[PDB]
Amino acid sequence: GTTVHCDYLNRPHKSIHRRRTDPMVTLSSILESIINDMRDLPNTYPFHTPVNAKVVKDYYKIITRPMDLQTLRENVRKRLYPSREEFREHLELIVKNSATYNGPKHSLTQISQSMLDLCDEKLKEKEDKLARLEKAINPLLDDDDQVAFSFILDNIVTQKMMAVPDSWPFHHPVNKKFVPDYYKVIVNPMDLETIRKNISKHKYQSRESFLDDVNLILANSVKYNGPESQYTKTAQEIVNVCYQTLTEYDEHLTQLEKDICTAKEAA
């Protein structure tokens, strides 16, 4: 057995720094600006900061992934968003949580939606400028091999992994409401939906990076459910089906990995 070698995929290291003219920074500015616009919208103050557990004692027991404009701004400053996609995904979480806790039609949810609508209008307004920044941050976004690679992986997830019997519990993030202590035991949650969203954003340039997330699903199940749990046996099968399929696509994937590596280097 052997694997493809590529030294440019893990470069530069995350030990790199913050330059003002850095593309990632410039983007953080446009995004933070949109945050100021949503915060300025009438009656949005409930979403400006995290829910106060002292006031709403059951909020963090019902909401799996909490989000607010303050936390959103913090993430932007830490340059956690390589593109508008990652940004919008976190933003809509505010709308989703309000729908879950207050109701799909609650006035609060409608208000949170107004922030999301404004965000989209802003994004579509700075369409081109945003496109160039995202491409400058990750040239691979416009690379056909990277796109072909992602497309194949996404099919491994939807065609093979999600097809495993009883696999549903691993299709989406564990819902805290039904498994109250899950996140107190699992500090590195992972699930098939999250992996698909990463694939959509071309996070993986090789099988290895893809498997680092795939493996977490089984590892987490072993940790929370136990080595002999029925849930772990299912997760084991999800991984096994993924591995088996990877060997079947070895020829195509190896070639794509080499091209992506070449494109990664040229970038």
Coordinates of C-alpha atoms in Angstrom, one line a residue:
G1 CA 0.0 0.0 0.0
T2 CA 1.0 3.6 -0.7
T3 CA -0.3 7.1 -1.0
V4 CA 0.2 10.4 -2.9
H5 CA 2.7 12.9 -1.6
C6 CA 2.1 16.7 -1.5
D7 CA 4.0 19.1 0.6
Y8 CA 2.2 22.2 -0.5
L9 CA -1.2 21.2 0.9
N10 CA -0.2 21.9 4.5
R11 CA 1.5 25.3 3.7
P12 CA 1.6 27.9 4.9
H13 CA 1.4 26.8 8.6
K14 CA -1.2 28.2 10.9
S15 CA 1.7 29.9 12.7
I16 CA 1.5 32.6 10.0
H17 CA 0.4 36.2 10.8
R18 CA -1.9 39.1 10.3
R19 CA -1.1 41.6 7.5
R20 CA -3.5 44.5 7.0
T21 CA -3.5 44.2 3.2
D22 CA -3.9 40.5 3.5
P23 CA -6.9 39.3 1.5
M24 CA -8.4 37.5 4.5
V25 CA -8.2 40.7 6.4
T26 CA -9.8 42.9 3.7
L27 CA -12.7 40.4 3.6
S28 CA -13.1 40.5 7.3
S29 CA -13.7 44.2 6.9
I30 CA -16.5 43.9 4.4
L31 CA -18.1 41.2 6.6
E32 CA -17.7 43.2 9.8
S33 CA -19.3 46.1 8.0
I34 CA -22.3 44.0 7.1
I35 CA -22.5 43.1 10.8
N36 CA -22.8 46.7 11.7
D37 CA -25.6 47.1 9.2
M38 CA -27.6 44.2 10.6
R39 CA -27.0 45.4 14.1
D40 CA -28.4 48.8 13.1
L41 CA -31.7 47.3 12.0
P42 CA -34.6 48.1 14.3
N43 CA -35.5 45.7 17.1
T44 CA -32.5 43.4 16.6
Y45 CA -30.9 43.9 20.0
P46 CA -31.9 40.4 21.2
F47 CA -29.5 39.0 18.6
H48 CA -26.6 41.4 19.3
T49 CA -25.2 39.3 22.2
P50 CA -25.4 35.7 23.4
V51 CA -28.5 34.6 25.3
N52 CA -28.1 35.2 29.1
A53 CA -28.4 31.7 30.6
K54 CA -29.3 33.5 33.9
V55 CA -32.4 35.0 32.2
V56 CA -33.3 32.1 29.9
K57 CA -32.3 29.1 32.0
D58 CA -33.2 26.5 29.4
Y59 CA -31.8 28.1 26.2
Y60 CA -28.4 26.4 26.1
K61 CA -30.2 23.1 26.9
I62 CA -32.3 23.3 23.7
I63 CA -29.9 25.1 21.3
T64 CA -27.1 23.0 19.9
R65 CA -25.0 25.6 18.1
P66 CA -25.7 29.1 19.6
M67 CA -24.8 32.2 17.6
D68 CA -25.1 36.0 17.9
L69 CA -23.8 39.1 16.2
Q70 CA -21.1 39.5 18.9
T71 CA -19.8 36.0 18.5
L72 CA -20.1 36.5 14.8
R73 CA -18.0 39.6 14.9
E74 CA -15.4 37.9 17.1
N75 CA -15.1 35.1 14.6
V76 CA -14.7 37.6 11.7
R77 CA -11.9 39.3 13.6
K78 CA -10.1 36.0 14.1
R79 CA -10.3 35.5 10.3
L80 CA -12.3 32.4 10.6
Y81 CA -14.2 33.0 7.4
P82 CA -12.3 32.4 4.1
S83 CA -15.4 33.5 2.1
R84 CA -18.9 34.8 2.3
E85 CA -20.1 31.2 2.5
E86 CA -18.6 30.3 5.8
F87 CA -19.9 33.7 7.1
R88 CA -23.5 33.4 5.9
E89 CA -23.6 29.8 7.3
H90 CA -22.9 31.1 10.8
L91 CA -25.3 34.1 10.4
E92 CA -28.3 31.9 9.4
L93 CA -27.6 30.0 12.5
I94 CA -29.1 33.0 14.3
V95 CA -32.3 32.7 12.3
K96 CA -32.4 28.9 12.8
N97 CA -31.9 29.1 16.5
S98 CA -34.7 31.7 16.8
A99 CA -37.0 29.5 14.8
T100 CA -36.1 26.6 17.1
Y101 CA -36.5 28.5 20.3
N102 CA -39.1 31.2 19.5
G103 CA -40.9 29.7 16.6
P104 CA -40.6 29.9 12.8
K105 CA -43.1 32.8 12.8
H106 CA -42.2 34.5 16.1
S107 CA -41.6 38.2 15.6
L108 CA -38.0 37.6 16.8
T109 CA -37.4 35.1 14.1
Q110 CA -38.8 37.5 11.5
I111 CA -36.5 40.1 12.8
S112 CA -33.4 37.8 12.6
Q113 CA -34.5 37.1 9.1
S114 CA -34.4 40.8 8.3
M115 CA -30.7 40.8 9.3
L116 CA -30.1 37.8 7.0
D117 CA -31.9 39.5 4.1
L118 CA -29.8 42.7 4.5
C119 CA -26.7 40.5 4.6
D120 CA -27.6 38.9 1.3
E121 CA -28.4 42.2 -0.4
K122 CA -25.0 43.5 0.8
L123 CA -23.2 40.4 -0.4
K124 CA -24.9 40.6 -3.8
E125 CA -24.0 44.2 -3.9
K126 CA -20.3 43.6 -3.5
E127 CA -20.5 40.5 -5.6
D128 CA -17.5 40.9 -7.9
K129 CA -15.2 42.5 -5.2
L130 CA -16.0 39.6 -2.9
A131 CA -15.4 37.0 -5.7
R132 CA -11.9 38.3 -6.3
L133 CA -11.0 38.4 -2.6
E134 CA -12.2 34.8 -2.1
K135 CA -10.3 33.6 -5.2
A136 CA -7.1 35.5 -4.0
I137 CA -7.5 33.7 -0.6
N138 CA -7.9 30.3 -2.2
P139 CA -7.1 30.1 -5.9
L140 CA -8.2 26.5 -5.9
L141 CA -11.8 27.7 -5.7
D142 CA -11.7 28.2 -9.4
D143 CA -9.7 25.1 -10.2
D144 CA -11.5 22.4 -12.1
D145 CA -9.6 19.6 -10.6
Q146 CA -10.3 20.8 -7.1
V147 CA -14.0 21.0 -8.1
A148 CA -13.9 17.5 -9.6
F149 CA -12.2 16.1 -6.5
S150 CA -14.9 17.7 -4.3
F151 CA -17.7 16.4 -6.5
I152 CA -16.4 12.9 -6.2
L153 CA -16.0 13.0 -2.4
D154 CA -19.5 14.5 -2.0
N155 CA -20.8 11.5 -3.9
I156 CA -19.0 9.1 -1.6
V157 CA -20.8 10.8 1.2
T158 CA -24.3 10.9 -0.3
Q159 CA -24.1 7.8 -2.4
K160 CA -22.2 5.5 -0.1
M161 CA -21.8 6.7 3.5
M162 CA -25.3 8.2 3.9
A163 CA -26.7 4.9 2.5
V164 CA -25.5 2.8 5.4
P165 CA -28.4 1.3 7.4
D166 CA -29.4 3.2 10.6
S167 CA -26.8 5.9 9.8
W168 CA -29.1 8.8 10.3
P169 CA -27.8 9.8 13.7
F170 CA -24.5 10.6 12.0
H171 CA -26.0 12.6 9.1
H172 CA -26.3 15.8 11.1
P173 CA -24.8 17.4 14.3
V174 CA -26.0 15.6 17.4
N175 CA -29.0 17.5 18.7
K176 CA -28.3 18.6 22.3
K177 CA -32.0 18.5 23.1
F178 CA -32.1 14.7 22.7
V179 CA -28.5 13.9 23.9
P180 CA -28.0 16.5 26.7
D181 CA -24.5 15.6 27.7
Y182 CA -23.1 14.9 24.2
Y183 CA -21.1 18.0 23.8
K184 CA -19.8 17.8 27.3
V185 CA -18.1 14.5 26.2
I186 CA -17.3 15.3 22.6
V187 CA -15.2 18.4 22.1
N188 CA -14.7 17.8 18.4
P189 CA -18.1 17.1 16.9
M190 CA -18.3 15.9 13.3
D191 CA -21.1 14.5 11.2
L192 CA -21.8 13.9 7.5
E193 CA -23.6 17.2 6.9
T194 CA -20.8 19.2 8.2
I195 CA -18.4 17.2 6.0
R196 CA -20.6 17.9 3.0
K197 CA -20.6 21.6 3.7
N198 CA -16.8 21.5 3.9
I199 CA -16.8 19.7 0.5
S200 CA -19.0 22.4 -0.9
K201 CA -16.4 24.9 0.2
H202 CA -13.5 22.7 -1.2
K203 CA -11.9 22.2 2.2
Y204 CA -10.3 18.9 1.1
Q205 CA -7.4 18.7 -1.4
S206 CA -6.7 15.1 -0.6
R207 CA -8.1 11.9 0.8
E208 CA -6.1 12.3 4.0
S209 CA -7.7 15.7 4.9
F210 CA -11.1 14.2 4.1
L211 CA -10.4 11.2 6.2
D212 CA -9.4 13.3 9.2
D213 CA -13.0 14.4 9.5
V214 CA -14.5 11.1 8.4
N215 CA -12.6 9.3 11.2
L216 CA -13.8 11.7 13.8
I217 CA -17.3 10.3 13.3
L218 CA -16.3 6.8 14.3
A219 CA -13.8 8.1 17.0
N220 CA -16.5 10.2 18.6
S221 CA -19.0 7.4 18.6
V222 CA -16.5 5.1 20.3
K223 CA -15.9 7.8 22.9
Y224 CA -19.5 8.7 23.6
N225 CA -21.4 5.5 22.8
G226 CA -18.7 2.9 23.6
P227 CA -16.7 0.4 21.5
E228 CA -19.5 -2.1 21.5
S229 CA -22.4 0.3 21.0
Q230 CA -24.8 -0.4 18.2
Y231 CA -24.2 3.2 17.2
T232 CA -20.5 2.6 17.0
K233 CA -21.0 -0.5 14.9
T234 CA -23.0 1.7 12.5
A235 CA -20.3 4.4 12.5
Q236 CA -17.7 1.7 11.8
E237 CA -19.7 0.7 8.7
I238 CA -19.9 4.3 7.5
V239 CA -16.1 4.5 7.7
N240 CA -15.6 1.1 6.2
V241 CA -17.9 1.9 3.2
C242 CA -16.0 5.2 2.7
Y243 CA -12.6 3.4 2.7
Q244 CA -13.7 0.7 0.4
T245 CA -15.1 3.3 -2.0
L246 CA -11.8 5.3 -1.9
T247 CA -9.9 2.2 -3.1
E248 CA -12.3 1.8 -5.9
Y249 CA -11.7 5.4 -7.0
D250 CA -8.0 5.2 -6.4
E251 CA -7.0 5.8 -10.0
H252 CA -9.2 8.9 -10.5
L253 CA -8.5 10.3 -7.1
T254 CA -4.7 9.8 -7.3
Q255 CA -4.6 11.7 -10.6
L256 CA -6.8 14.5 -9.2
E257 CA -4.7 14.7 -6.0
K258 CA -1.6 15.2 -8.2
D259 CA -3.2 17.9 -10.3
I260 CA -4.5 19.7 -7.3
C261 CA -1.1 19.5 -5.8
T262 CA 0.4 21.0 -9.0
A263 CA -2.4 23.7 -8.9
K264 CA -1.8 24.2 -5.2
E265 CA 1.9 24.8 -5.8
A266 CA 1.3 27.2 -8.7
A267 CA -1.1 29.1 -6.5

